[PDB]
């Protein structure tokens, strides 16, 4: 009954509805296909991620951690963010039913957070809440986007090889002692089937509206296409592009963008979209709003930080166009190999200073308290940055 294959990165199993003997409803991963003559669903095409794409992502997260030695925690968080956004944005639909990719995502986030923890020379859980890693980069944290705090389906490997049982038992993904919920990225990205169905009726409405405007010569209305300014699969906003008259001549650009892997060392993760020709196909602005409600708000973020000891009047003055000063001057000089990696531990001292109540907290698991030389601070164990 199943006809199946594997295109660009997708593993697809088309099964016609007359061969089902029970029609059930499905989650995101199932595209249901249209007869287009009678406008009636006549099949379902179940999606999953190919295994070499899973291995490519795993290898990419391996390459981040090897290539980045002495490497300014914020920069590691940014590289993680791009390597997760490209993953979740390309195969959107088919993340959901792929079990080993959820497992490798859990292992990937704990490797990035373990990189920050081993940079601080402490892998203790209680020093590092989700407030450290998951606050936005303007409140002081690392700014990393989570996709691992879900529960993984785990159900009966002996029958899962034979039957496609279903999700009967959940198993824990990635937790901490304080139970903050942390939103995953997959809720905020629009799945491909919905955005294709939306694109059909949006470009159809634009066809009728343009063809009725050229009748009576209203000649257009940007006011009219305002709620439909960011629908559509070529993204209606690219129709009124800034320089479209010289992009009318750029033909053959998907293949030109793909073959840059054979002639450029530093690759690009977004080899599939071209923003001038195709639009901004994704937006993650609301994720940064919902994480701050997830961690509890600016009060429960700032009781971890060292904001109380500074004595600003308000948290609103945390936001400025901050110039780097010394290290900006020093990164351009003639400077030794050993002397240039020392420059990258200047941002890490500021990050370690800002979250220093939470890092140097008192409810520790093991740790022998020592005291600084000319002060009275007891620091539990030994962090050398702090």
């Amino acid at each position: 009954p199943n006809l199946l294959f594997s295109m660009c990165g997708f593993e697809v199993r088309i099964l016609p509805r007359q061969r089902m003997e029970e029609v059930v409803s499905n989650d995101e991963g199932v595209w249901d296909l249209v007869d287009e003559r009678t406008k009636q669903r006549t099949a379902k095409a179940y999606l999953k991620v190919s295994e070499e794409e899973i291995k490519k992502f795993d290898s990419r997260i391996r390459g981040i951690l090897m290539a980045s030695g002495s490497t300014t925690f914020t920069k590691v968080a940014a590289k993680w963010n791009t390597s997760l956004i490209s993953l979740f944005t390309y195969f959107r639909e088919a993340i959901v039913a792929t079990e080993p990719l959820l497992d490798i995502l859990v292992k990937g986030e704990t490797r990035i957070q373990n990189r920050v923890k081993l940079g601080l020379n402490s892998k203790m859980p209680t020093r590092f809440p989700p407030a450290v890693f998951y606050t936005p980069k303007e409140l002081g944290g690392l700014g990393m986007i989570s996709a691992s705090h879900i529960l993984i389906p785990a159900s009966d490997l002996s029958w899962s090889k034979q039957t496609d049982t279903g999700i009967t038992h959940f198993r824990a993904g990635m937790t901490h002692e304080d139970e903050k919920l942390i939103p995953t990225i997959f809720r905020y990205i629009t799945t491909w089937e919905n955005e294709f169905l939306d694109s059909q009726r949006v470009w159809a409405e634009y066809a009728t509206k343009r063809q009725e405007a050229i009748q009576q010569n209203r000649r257009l209305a940007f006011e009219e296409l305002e709620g439909s300014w960011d629908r559509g699969i070529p993204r209606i906003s690219t129709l009124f592009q800034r320089d479209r008259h010289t992009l009318a001549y750029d033909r053959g650009h998907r293949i030109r963008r793909e073959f840059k892997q054979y002639s450029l060392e530093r690759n690009s993760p977004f080899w599939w979209t071209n923003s001038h020709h195709d639009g901004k196909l994704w937006n993650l602005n609301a994720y940064r709003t919902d994480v701050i409600q997830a961690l509890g708000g600016i009060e429960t973020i700032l009781e971890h930080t060292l904001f109380k000891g500074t004595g600003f009047n308000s948290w609103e003055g945390l936001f400025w166009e901050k110039a780097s000063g010394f290290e900006d001057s020093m990164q351009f000089k003639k400077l030794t190999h050993a002397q240039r990696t020392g420059l990258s531990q200047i941002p890490n001292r500021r990050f370690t200073l800002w979250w220093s109540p939470t890092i140097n907290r008192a409810n520790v698991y093991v740790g022998f308290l020592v005291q600084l030389d000319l002060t009275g601070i007891f620091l539990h164990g030994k962090i050398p940055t702090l």
Binding site: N26, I95, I182, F186, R187, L197
Partner: protein
């Protein structure tokens, strides 16, 4: 009490990449019988906020309705209230 409850329901609903997983979390909460209509209302109001319909908010509603008679009477009330 109403706003913080909507925030707890929204944060449960807004992690959990499967409809079955959000349905597991909300049926694990075991909300009392009076507030089930409020939970269904928050689910529908959150479903409206995106740019399109998704099968997440359908799957979680089906796994609510096939759990108990009270969730089905909550949905049969919420259709009339909508």
């Amino acid at each position: 009490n109403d706003v913080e409850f909507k925030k707890k329901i929204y944060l449960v609903l807004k992690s959990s990449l499967s409809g079955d997983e959000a349905a597991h979390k909300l049926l694990k909460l075991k909300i009392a019988n009076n507030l089930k209509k409020s939970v269904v209302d928050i689910i529908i109001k959150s479903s409206l906020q995106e740019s399109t319909f998704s099968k997440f908010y359908s799957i979680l509603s089906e796994r609510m309705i096939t759990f108990h008679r009270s969730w089905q009477t909550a949905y049969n009330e919420t259709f009339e209230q909508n």
